[PDB]
Amino acid sequence: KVFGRCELAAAMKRHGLDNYRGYSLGNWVCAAKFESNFNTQATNRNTDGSTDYGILQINSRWWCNDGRTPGSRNLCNIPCSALLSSDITASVNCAKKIVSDGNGMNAWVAWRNRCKGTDVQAWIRGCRL
């Protein structure tokens, strides 16, 4: 499913992402925009053989099991396919674990390079939240 900007803001807010670990809702929406263009089905292969899945492009090397990333840990305890669902719950719960592991949202390259230090509030401007 391809989310609309406000539709995703609303769903993320409902899932407790607004201000989770100090990161306002605008940060998450911005990250989703640049990581997957709001598409829950996005996948991208990395040079190391691992793959990124879903709206938040979670990696198979550490977070989920896709059956083809040797020696990977399944820290979120879920098949990577669950992260491609129209229901963002699995992606949200796993992201909360990632953002809590010490590096914050810096774990998301697009966030660090395209959202960090920008006016992230603009990503939720106009949405009835």
UniProtKB/Swiss-Prot annotation:
The answer, when asked if Cytoplasm is one of the entry's keywords, is: no
The disulfides recorded in the entry are 6-127, 30-115, 64-80, 76-94
What's an example Gene Ontology biological process for this entry?
A: killing of cells of another organism
The chain positions of domain C-type lysozyme read 1-129
For the keyword Hydrolase, the answer is: yes
How does the annotation summarize its subunit structure?
Monomer.
Q: This chain belongs to which protein, by name?
A: Lysozyme C
Biological classification of the source: Eukaryota, Metazoa, Chordata, Craniata, Vertebrata
